[PDB]
Each structure stands twice: as structure tokens, then as C-alpha cells.
Symmetry: C2
Subunit: 216 residues, 2 copies
Amino acid sequence: GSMKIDVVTIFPEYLQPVRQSLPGKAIDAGLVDVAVHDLRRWTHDVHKSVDDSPYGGGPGMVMKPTVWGDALDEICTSETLLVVPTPAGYPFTQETAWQWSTEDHLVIACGRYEGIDQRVADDAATRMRVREVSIGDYVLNGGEAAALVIIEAVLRLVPGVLGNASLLEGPSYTRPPSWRGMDVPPVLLSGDHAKIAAWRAEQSRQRTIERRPDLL
Amino acid sequence: SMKIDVVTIFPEYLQPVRQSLPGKAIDAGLVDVAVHDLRRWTHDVHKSVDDSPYGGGPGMVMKPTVWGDALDEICTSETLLVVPTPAGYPFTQETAWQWSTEDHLVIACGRYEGIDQRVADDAATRMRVREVSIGDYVLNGGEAAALVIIEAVLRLVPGVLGNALSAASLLEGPSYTRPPSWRGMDVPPVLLSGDHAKIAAWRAEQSRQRTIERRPDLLGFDS
């Protein structure tokens, strides 16, 4: 029905267009609020340090637990579902999106792919629900783009929020009936709606075998 | 240098490219990203990009005429045309490595119920075309998927990686940093021990344990 989403990131501008994309009707009805927070607000030092070298050595940096702990202490409540995008996560799927669409409060913690110190999520899990999730089998430098994907996939399932109303979907067609020598499949113009459904099912089957044989 | 052209009815949604890693790649001159409003190629007063489907169905389908004109202008025979769609082949780390070597990516962002299939089919007669899914979920449009692809590709381009290119199927385990104790929670003592062999072994184990818990498919087990 209605959802608050807080996003925490060192790149708050990354989230601005998705804020601007919420229809005013949904905001005014109180169906949705998306707030973005600069993680640096919770830094302790004059240099606004958010990361530090990894224990046990090796490359990259790990985000500081003291900074994230303070940020989440402020932003989260007992009702919060804390979402942490990471290539090391459980898979985020359409089933996940449906589940999260009825939450009252998502907090999305965007960090670099080398990680937020694991104690942040471990501590947070003692007082709220935490879900570390991957949006696909690739690495991104940080969680921000994954956050945009999650926000969109979840909110388009909340009635009235984004303005929108197994086997893969097959090809779609519109006017004109002939274009650059390619005709729309004549079955779609036949007025035989049972036949059209069967044709679409076969297109779906062939496409799934070709692109996603894992689904069969 | 790589050129990335992104074509969309929401050019504003692509502004995040100027942030973080893509922004740094652009500033370093390793990539040029241009965003084009599809409506530039319309000719009617209402700048129509969509029409109702043939054969029935809810929603609308993006018109082939408008897309064909856009792609004619932007693409060459050397272009790799990328079409994000939940009905695509999977976009994976391997795809990202492959595309990191391309001279020209054009990313065609769809909305509504998708793009008339003849756009991709026509394009494939003159250039390489790849319809790809970034994951098993549905979005309202290709724009967020375009940003994911750009991020995943650009962090692998040689000007970004440097010496790392010349120097996988498992999840990274947990990471830690200072202080060694926080809220009563200690960093695993092995990581403080300075013993490189023991640390490597612990990290490998943690990686395999997290993989079996979170992603058993990666190790060839049932999901």
C-alpha cells in the first residue's frame, strides 16, 4: 500500500532522478517517500573517512563499521528491512520484489563491492531484518546502480506508485504491418484469438529454449 | 577509447552516469557517453513513440519507424547494439568482459511493453545485436539496466584496471576493518594473526561457505 525508502550512499546525486520520477499523485497520497542520505553525515573525522584498509590484507578498502553503525542507528527502526546490495548476496528476483512490495520501510545501504565491514550487517540483524542481495552475476563498483534497480522493481508492484499498470515473453509488434521488408506475423491480424494465444505460447517456448534453457 | 550511446525517452534518468566510476572514466577520457532523447526522431506534433500491439495485449509497443531512424543515425556496421529486456540472454560477468573491449556500444532503452521485434531483427542485418537481461525481475524500462551494464563494463576497461588486467565462479566472503572490536563483536582472530597462509585458507573457506548458503547453483547444487 504505502512505503518509505531511505537510501544511504556516498553518491547521493546518483539517486536524484529516481526521486524526481515519483508521480506527485503518489507522494501527495502518502503512498511513497524516497529519501537519500549522504553517508558522510555520519563520519567522525575532519577527513570524512568512510573506508579503511582490510584486515588480513589484500586490495581495495572496506567501509568503516563505526560510520555505518551510526547511520543505521539513526535511520532504521524495528520495522525496517535493511537491504544491502552486494555481488556476494542472495539473488534478488521477481519473487523478492513482490515480497518487499508490501514492506513499510526499506533502508538500502549502498557500499563499495569490497564490502561494508561484516559486523554492520551482523549487528543490525540482531534488531531488524537484513537481506544482502545480488541483482545479477556481475560485479559493479558499488551498490548505487543496484539500488536503482531494486527500487524500481519493488515500487512498480505497489499499486499507484510508479504510474504503470516459467517462460520468457515473445516478440511484440505494432504498426505498420510491413516495415523494411518485414511483415507482422499474419496470425496476429487473424481475429482468431485462441490461435493467437497458441502462436504466442510457441514463440515463448522457442525463445526460452534459445535464451534461457535453464528455465525449462 | 569507447563510445557509448544510450537512446531513451527519459534522458534525465541517465544522469547517474556522471557519478562514481562512470564519471571518473568519462573525466579520464577513457569513454564518451552520449544520451539521446528518442523523441528527436519523431515527426508528429505529439512526438509519438508508441502504439497499441497487434494481436492484443495490455499496454503499448514502441514504434519501429522511430527507432529505425534513430539507430540509422547513431549506429554503424561496427556497433554492438545492446537491448535490455527481461526476455534477453543473461548479461553476466563474462558478457561484461567481452563488451569491455568494444569500440562502440549503443544501448536502446525500451518502455511500455517493449520495442517492436523488427527493430532488433532489422538491425541484426547490418550490425551485431544482443538482447540481454540483467536479472530475473521486471522493470518499467531499460534505463536502470543501461546504467548497470555501463557500470559493469566500464570498471573492466584497460584504462580503469591498469596493471590488474595482466595480474570468479565464487562469492567473496566477509570483510573487516578497524577497530578490531566493535559493539562486542570481534574481527576473526586469524585476520589479525599476520599468517598469510592461514588467512588465505580462511578466506577461501569463507568464500565456499557463503557460496553454498547464498548461491548453491554456483557450485552445481539445487537452488
